[PDB]
Design an enzyme around this catalytic site. Sequence first.
Site, short mmCIF file in Angstrom:
data_model
loop_
_atom_site.label_atom_id
_atom_site.label_comp_id
_atom_site.label_asym_id
_atom_site.label_seq_id
_atom_site.Cartn_x
_atom_site.Cartn_y
_atom_site.Cartn_z
N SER A 295 -1.15 2.92 -8.47
CA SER A 295 0.00 2.25 -7.84
C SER A 295 -0.51 1.53 -6.61
O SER A 295 -1.22 2.14 -5.78
CB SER A 295 1.08 3.24 -7.42
OG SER A 295 2.30 2.57 -7.13
N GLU A 296 -0.14 0.26 -6.47
CA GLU A 296 -0.74 -0.60 -5.45
C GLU A 296 -0.43 -0.17 -4.02
O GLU A 296 -1.19 -0.48 -3.11
CB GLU A 296 -0.37 -2.07 -5.65
CG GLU A 296 1.09 -2.38 -5.43
CD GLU A 296 1.52 -3.63 -6.16
OE1 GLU A 296 1.56 -3.63 -7.40
OE2 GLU A 296 1.84 -4.61 -5.48
N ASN A 297 0.68 0.54 -3.86
CA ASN A 297 1.04 1.13 -2.57
C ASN A 297 0.30 2.41 -2.23
O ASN A 297 0.69 3.06 -1.27
CB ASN A 297 2.55 1.36 -2.49
CG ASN A 297 3.05 2.31 -3.53
OD1 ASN A 297 2.51 2.37 -4.63
ND2 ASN A 297 4.13 3.03 -3.21
#
Lengths: 469, 466, 467, 467
Positions: A295-297
């Site tokens: 997940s990019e976060n």
Amino acid sequence: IGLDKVMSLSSAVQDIKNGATLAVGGFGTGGMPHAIMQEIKKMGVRDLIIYSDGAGVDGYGIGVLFENKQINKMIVSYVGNNKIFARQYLEGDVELEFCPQGSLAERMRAGGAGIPAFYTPTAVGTVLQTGGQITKYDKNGGVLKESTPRETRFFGGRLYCLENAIKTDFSIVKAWKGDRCGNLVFRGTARNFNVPVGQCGQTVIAEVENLVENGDIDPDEVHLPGVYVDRVVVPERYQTLIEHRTVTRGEEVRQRIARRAALEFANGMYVNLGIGIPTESSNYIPAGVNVVLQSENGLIGMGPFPTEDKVDADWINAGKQTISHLAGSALFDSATSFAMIRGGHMDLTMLGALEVAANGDLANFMIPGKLVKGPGGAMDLVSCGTRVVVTTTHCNKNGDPKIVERCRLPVTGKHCVCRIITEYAVFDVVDGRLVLKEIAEDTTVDQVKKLTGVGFDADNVITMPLAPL
Amino acid sequence: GLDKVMSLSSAVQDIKNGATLAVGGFGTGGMPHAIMQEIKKMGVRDLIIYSDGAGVDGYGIGVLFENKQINKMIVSYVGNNKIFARQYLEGDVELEFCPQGSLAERMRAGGAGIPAFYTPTAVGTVLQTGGQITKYDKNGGVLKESTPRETRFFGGRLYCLENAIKTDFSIVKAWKGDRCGNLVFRGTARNFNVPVGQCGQTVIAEVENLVENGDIDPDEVHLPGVYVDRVVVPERYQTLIEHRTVTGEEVRQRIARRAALEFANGMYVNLGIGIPTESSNYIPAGVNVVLQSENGLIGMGPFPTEDKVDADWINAGKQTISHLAGSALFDSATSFAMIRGGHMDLTMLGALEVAANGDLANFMIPGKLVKGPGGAMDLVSCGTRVVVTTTHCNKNGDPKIVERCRLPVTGKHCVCRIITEYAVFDVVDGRLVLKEIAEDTTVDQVKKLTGVGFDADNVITMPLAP
Amino acid sequence: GLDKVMSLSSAVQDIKNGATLAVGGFGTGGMPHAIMQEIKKMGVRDLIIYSDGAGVDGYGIGVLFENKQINKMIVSYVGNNKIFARQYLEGDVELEFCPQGSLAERMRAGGAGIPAFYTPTAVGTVLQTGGQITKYDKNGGVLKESTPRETRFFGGRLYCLENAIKTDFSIVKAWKGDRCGNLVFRGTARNFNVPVGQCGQTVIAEVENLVENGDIDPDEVHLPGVYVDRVVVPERYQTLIEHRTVTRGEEVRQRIARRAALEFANGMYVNLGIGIPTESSNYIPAGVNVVLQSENGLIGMGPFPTEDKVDADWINAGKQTISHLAGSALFDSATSFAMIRGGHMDLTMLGALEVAANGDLANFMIPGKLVKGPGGAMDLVSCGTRVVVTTTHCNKNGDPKIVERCRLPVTGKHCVCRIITEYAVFDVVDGRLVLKEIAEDTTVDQVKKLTGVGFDADNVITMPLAP
Amino acid sequence: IGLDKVMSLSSAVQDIKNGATLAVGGFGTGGMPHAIMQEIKKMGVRDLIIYSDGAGVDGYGIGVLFENKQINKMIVSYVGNNKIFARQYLEGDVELEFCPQGSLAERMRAGGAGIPAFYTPTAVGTVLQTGGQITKYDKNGGVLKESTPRETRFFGGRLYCLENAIKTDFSIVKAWKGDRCGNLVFRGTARNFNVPVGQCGQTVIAEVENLVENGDIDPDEVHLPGVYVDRVVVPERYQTLIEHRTVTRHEVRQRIARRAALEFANGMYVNLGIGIPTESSNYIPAGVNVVLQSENGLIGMGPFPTEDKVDADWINAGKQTISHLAGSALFDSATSFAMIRGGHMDLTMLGALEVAANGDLANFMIPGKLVKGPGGAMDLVSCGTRVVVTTTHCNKNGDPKIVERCRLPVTGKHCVCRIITEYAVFDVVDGRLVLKEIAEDTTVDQVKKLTGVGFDADNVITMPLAP
Ligand SMILES: [Ca+2]
Ligand SMILES: [Ca+2]
Ligand SMILES: [Ca+2]
Ligand SMILES: [Ca+2]
């Protein structure tokens, strides 16, 4: 015993002057310093310039500041579900400068790191490179200001954008725990931009959910060393707003696209999966194929939606949905997350598209003068250099092809899509041109000719297989 | 989930002749010694290795020197390594120095898809201009020289372009890892292991403790498992402690006693070994400083007590150290982002030469004492107040305070104050001005003892810290 | 059809204090002395001037030093100008050196809408690293040093970034102009007048001869009138000849010339520095026909003219009157340094204060003591071309001029191909000296003792000398 | 007296081997070495790469080499009236790389001058900067290759493109006169690319209409100094093909031309493109004295000549025969685009396919149908000179031409100041339009529906016309 940097919330914010530049942590509402934002609303400071992943949401974190039009300019990767923000952009109250998410995070890091500029393949050949993105309107729908172009240079025969370091007057961060000398520990995916944000401001202000004494935090567990923090505030405790409270307890071409996309996974892969068909495809991964979702976060090991008991505002995915994590997961900040992505550490990136071209260009990003959200992390994801698969319905609902010779819609990335999976077909992009690899059990090559807006090679087509249940 | 666990021999068997390796560690701290022994046993040659240093004799990368397996070292500091230094001078190994901050960040940029970045570090030095000897032939003559770095202006100031480092292999040591590759480090043994971890095509991690997936808290993982390809669990061994430090010199005391008055309350400070470090022991009554160590610590304390000695808790000079309350650990990319970003309030170092221009030479004398820039090039060039502590004259009678440097410059226009046993100087408008004097030699006798002229009109008498 | 003609006084009256000028001329040749005179009269102060040189004492730009009208000079060469050098030494004048080829091309780039361009010239010298002293205080203390040039690699080698020069005024001189400002120049007095003429906001030209429009063949125009704002016709005056050279003990010099003469081959285009390299052109053997380039903008340069064919417009790089041979061609200074920087010379032969086993050369200035400048030497040495240094083997006093590493500021880095002296001929191979020839019946042992470094001496022949 | 480089046509050409890169002089047919291209056809060299302003014309010059498929790739500014060229690009036998004219010329000079790269504002923000122009097709009309992007950098807050030096194995040049040394003299606008082409080749071959002896060309009249030329060929006399033998002998566009004529003003240097801008020159009123520039190297361009003064060497940018006026001046193409790029024109007046309220302009490509190249249009628009567009208010298909944002590929970005049509005159102000004038008593609501955008009319007058 050590340094004591604790202050009250009003005192910590009282010297922010009109015109100040802020860097603000947060991914959507996760790690968004809402308490401090509420206090800066109170002091009524005007024409702020704010660098942040987004602008929070209506009535939350940065979103609060639009209410008495305290914001002059936002520099942001995404607008998301923020109606006052978009409305004030469209009605000429606010300047809005887009920056791809990974570039925004690395620019803040860079400003903390004494690096005045660095190169990234992200945004190359997009409108964020060439300039002319609409950044400000007048009061009557007229274009008042436009984005300045980025400069570019070749390295090793590929073209890169020059990004400039971001340095702010203030930085506002949120953390799970801080000690009195300003060491911060974060929790879950609420870490995100809080590390690069804390490093790039002249005066950095940290709200903490828990204040502990110097020596209560294991030095080996510190995420932001206290050197970076100037002021720590302990607001009265509050529940982080959950945008999408997703929990585990039509037109299903989508399932067919997802079932073919599921054959792309191989054992041991690390994968980033976009909202919709890519994520859905993870439900059909066969037994004996073990892949780790990123997940990019700031997570690897991302699981399905949490069960009721596990629902946690600090643990959300890129679409701001509540998420679980699996055995062997690992959290990192937004700079590390885009280093991970930009550096091609994903084996598979699977994305939707509004239009995708025979040369491997693709457009989601935006539609100009229309529904305009921002690049998010899409531009970094596609320029990873890594295998990119697009999963999308073959045509628009009105008949227009989504597979074209060249993109009419503004480009998200240039020459980056490897494979296109639709309900009708599977195309490879081979040497900037399309090769029909598979067709669905009883369509024909002839109908896929008619449904796609470019030629392609069809000298070796097989039937498209699907993963079971 | 994933199981990447593997024997020592299998993990390393794919390393071929000519391979490039990025190797973690700072001296012996976090140096994957066991893997280095295996590389020796397998007998690959022509290695090109990027690492902070090259271990020490008989330990770590050091062991690969003894059957001459190493073609080229790219390093920040030679350290206490005789075979390494010997082989460079005799022409058996090629040696390129890279400033430590630049080495760590080039590795990170390699891992992060950033092909190049700018840093003020090393501008105007031999490391930017070329003309450091990187290879000798076998009779003292020059075979190869360092290639220049490009330069570019930003906001009226000049920076060096640094290029991404990508290696065939990266080799890393961690306190703990799980089966899927997540690593947790301990103490200052973290250092380069994080950026090194990120820059290799094939990444190998030697762990002191293996745990199952889900035994590590996701919030405590320092190197995410996506970066590690192979984990090895060697026969457990002790990390070599170089200096086991536990709880006619007067010249170094007085300079250190004057230099302790430079500390103001609430400062973050990086001290050099020798005089600048001993200045800490005379930190006055009511002054709270936080000490930074470049290998990845804030809140560094005095030498540990005998029983609390720990091989993973060492300072820049490779000495065992303690931590004070509120300490924080971080990796070498982060360490030099801190330093290069001007987050230190004071750095205090020594010198071979210091100019009236502000120029400082303190990293080598060509052909004789060659150690490398260490972190010194970063420390001087980041806009942090630099105070040099040094004896007024060298081990001849020649003034260590000259008009312009003759030995290779560590950095240009960077020294703010100079503190000696006899005098104290400030650099104003690119020239020297006497602000203090003590031991009570007059202006005229010091004026002859220095190699430059100077302004000397608001001269007070120099105090000392008790 | 335009008329740009004006009085001398009205043309110059608009130059305010602090104006920047670009000024044509090489030495005295093509130097607009009549306009410079007028600038003196009107008494404007704190000028910033870009020019190849700064005239000579009592002529051209040199005239402006008398009343301290100059704040800053940006030149390639000080030359025979004692007020200039003196005012630099004692803090009255700021002086920034620019390689002549870079100065010419920066002026043109300023005229041509090119903000910057890359050149190999000066790479690794003080002019790129910064630290040439540009300004002293009044007690011979360093006030300002030169700012560094940026550098980038192309094709695996390093180049300097040069910025365009655009000035408030440009001042040029020509033999001929029409009323709409087309200029024609004569001999080597063209030099910088072309690029200087292109880079000014207001460009004023003195012409020795004014003609009507339509009187110049459009094919013979050297500076198109579009570039020229104001044309002035001074009362006629004789251009100052620095060295009126005519055709009509320590003679180590002539043995060096005679050996260097054997470096010439048939069909070569060559540039020869002043001193021994020029003298060598006297000993060129019988079948060898070469064309001599003079960096002020001539190929086909001949020996000094006859007594009544002397001409102030035809001078060489050392400011001496000179002839031209059949098939000669004149060009301007941007072109001249395009020729050179482009590798179109086959041989360049230069003198040296100091030359390294490295192939480095030092021969342009010594801080605080010799104020000369790079001239064209940095360009000459750092283009593709074969460089031969002709020099006496030792200093007067016995110190070697052939050292391990240069102690003086280097003109070029790793550039010298061959070194010829009275004792020896060394080649530079792989960054060290290989002795190839020795004189007379001198010995490897005496040359070892006379050279400040070691060297390889395993195929040493005896040194030949042209007839 | 001197060097001798003269050779026969066949011997000079025989060592061009397959895969060779050529740089070729000429602008259309003017100054184009046709005889040499003929001989090269004879020898049968294959897979050429050619850098030239154009590829000549059917049956003429570079055009002669497309007949037997001798060309792999062309690097060109304009294809211009060459059907075999345009056809071989489209069906897929020749790879075509477009380069802006001024950039092409300066790249060649740069190759000659030892300058590896330089910057220019030309082409910034266009398809020629970003990549994604089609450079090669396959047999079925799909894109085999796209141009690679140009890199870019800011100087002084403005973005410039980086251009790379061009050097080739050979350079082929034509001159009116040459000596045995290789000193060349050109004639009329037949100089053009021959100077920078002559500088950038390893081996440079020059065909001369007239061979003379060394010493017969005044050294001050030489346009390409002999150092640059390796081989000099003297073909049999032949006439240069005139494409458009235009001569001065004994209505919608007239209104635009008469309004456009009012833009002229005393003292201006002006570049006019083909069509309504060249027409407007006819109607310059009063004592309004302008000077016309042709991008192929002329200032002082006059009307079409009288029958007995037509000359193939004196052509405009549209390849039409032309006269020249008193005070005229010729120069090569590198100088021409330095003049243009450096903002030495006061006014450039151009056509448009589309102009935007933005001030963007599309006049060089319409994908599929008209793919002739940037020519010099990109250089003329991005040089900061006052640009004025003259255009019909609508297409041949009846669509509007003043649009909001250009649909068609842009020639230049935020470049246009004034837009002149038969119906109205707009000014671009603050990045949007503002109507200032109308004619024939048609009014502010009649144009709005005929223009493709809204605009400002806070203070409007009626449109004055030149008589
Ligand atoms: Ca701070
Ligand atoms: Ca790997
Ligand atoms: Ca002017
Ligand atoms: Ca040649």
